[PDB]
């Protein structure tokens, strides 16, 4: 019943090849709805979902203003971080940010986020109390006390607890048909002998939304991790997701293995058996 909105940004410096590239995307749950790319020609926030196209021209102007501002802010932050770590302007580096909010089934505020990573690793993150910071190293401790003195956390609360949850609420209403549906997984199993002694059994889940799902193999009713392989959940490209789980079994003992599939859209966990 709960829902999330996230914005992800990536700034990458390209020394000797122009200003840093900035890419930002926005998501409601597992559904992208906007994008901005500093290298694209339009220089605008662009829709990536049908239900956000309802938004009028003032929305697109304003959201474009906000993301371009972020792009200039994080170009500066790349240079500051270069100074904090004492690195040369010769190398390429990455600043990623994520912010957004969670709401419960009744739409009320659950949690807010506002976090940075530098070169792939935690830098500074707003804590769940929306009052304090977790800094990952001595570089980020510089920023932590700057932001404590300037009360940057307090100045973010109106957005996280107000604009974010209000926007998320509006999007969930505008896109009910897309965002508030559950698509249950379509499941099947495949079977391949790999020698005269063993066989692969593969349990499939297809066409499910949201992406959250659990596939587990049991042997004689007990969980089985030995000789199992679970791939990352992947996008079909049409808005739904796919996953599989495989196990190598002794030839002739296929019937003692069961694959168990749990998903929001299933009123009962599924049990598959060859």
């Amino acid at each position: 019943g709960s829902h999330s909105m996230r914005y992800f940004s990536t700034s990458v410096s390209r020394p000797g090849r122009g200003e840093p590239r900035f890419i930002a995307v926005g998501y409601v749950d597992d559904t992208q709805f906007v994008r901005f790319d500093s290298d694209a020609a339009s220089q605008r926030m662009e829709p990536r979902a049908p239900w956000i196209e309802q938004e009028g021209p003032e929305y697109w102007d304003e959201e474009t203003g906000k993301v371009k501002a972020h792009s200039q802010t994080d170009r500066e932050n790349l240079r500051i971080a270069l100074r904090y770590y004492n690195q040369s302007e010769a190398g390429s580096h990455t600043l990623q940010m994520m912010f957004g909010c969670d709401v419960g089934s009744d739409g009320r505020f659950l949690r807010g986020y506002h976090q940075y990573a530098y070169d792939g690793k935690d830098y500074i993150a707003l804590k769940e109390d929306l009052r304090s910071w977790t800094a990952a190293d001595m570089a980020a401790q510089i920023t932590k006390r700057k932001w404590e003195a300037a009360h940057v956390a307090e100045q973010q609360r109106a957005y996280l607890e107000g604009t974010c949850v209000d926007g998320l609420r509006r999007y969930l209403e505008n896109g009910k048909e897309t965002l508030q549906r559950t698509d249950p997984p379509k499941t099947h199993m495949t079977h391949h002998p790999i020698s005269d002694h063993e066989a692969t059994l593969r349990c499939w889940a297809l066409g499910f939304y949201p992406a959250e799902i659990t596939l587990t193999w049991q042997r004689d009713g007990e969980d089985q991790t030995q000789d199992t392989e679970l791939v990352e959940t992947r996008p079909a490209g049409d808005g739904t997701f796919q996953k599989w789980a495989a196990v190598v079994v002794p030839s002739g003992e296929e019937q003692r293995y069961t694959c168990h599939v749990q998903h929001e859209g299933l009123p009962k966990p599924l049990t598959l058996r060859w």
Binding site: Y7, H70, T73, Y159
Partner: peptide
Amino acid sequence: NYNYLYRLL
């Protein structure tokens, strides 16, 4: 809705 982000590190 995006946030207004001007804060430097």
